[PDB]
Amino acid sequence: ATFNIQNHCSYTVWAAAVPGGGMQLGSGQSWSLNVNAGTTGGRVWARTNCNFDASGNGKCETGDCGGLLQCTAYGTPPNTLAEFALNQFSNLDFFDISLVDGFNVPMAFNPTSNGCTRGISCTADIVGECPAALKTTGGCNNPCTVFKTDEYCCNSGSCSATDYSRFFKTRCPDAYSYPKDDQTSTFTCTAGTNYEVVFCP
């Protein structure tokens, strides 16, 4: 499958993918990423305010993946996430936008083939609106990241929405706002669909 990863922000971002790596995308530039059929735990995200040396080692203000330009591991919150698992049960791809690891950059994540048309977006000014307890440089953290309790992180107990998850959910109703926000955040397409991930759509 092909992911068309497009930076429509006026600022440069450093696109990241696992599997895939990462590259600098100036405003208006795009990356076509091949993603094999059957991939699980897939993510695409943007990183902000990075500075990398000649060998691809360095730092990003949001979404840093172990100091690498070409990510092999997930990024450090906050990072708006396009998540996917391809060719799963019932001849389906499963995909979502997640704010469970926070928000940095607005995002659309849409199918582009196979007669799959229903996509996803989170475009609110979540950084400008972020509550004080969640705010950080370049982003808005999920309360699981900030507080690290089961109320927000749901390893055990009864996982329900919280005022801090609801902040994200009412502003981006399409996206996961807390770990068990499954019922209203799950998108599917026929297996084998292509996708776009657009920063600042």
Numbering used by the authors: 25 to 225
Which passages does the manuscript contain on this structure?
In this paper the crystal structure and some physico-chemical parameters relevant for the haze formation mechanism of three isoforms of TLPs isolated from grape juice were determined. Plant TLPs generally have three domains and a cleft located between domains I and II.
Domain II consists of a long α-helix (α4) and four α-helical segments (α1, α2, α3, and α5), and is stabilized by four disulfide bonds (residues 141–193, 149–159, 163–172, 173–180). Two disulfide bonds are shared by different domains: disulfide bond 89–95 connects domain I to III, while bond 141–193 connects domain I to II. However, from the structures of the three proteins, it is clear that they only significantly differ in two loop regions. From the detailed analysis of their structural features it appears that the difference in function among proteins is attributable to the differences observed in a loop located between β-strands 9 and 10 and of the neighbouring regions.
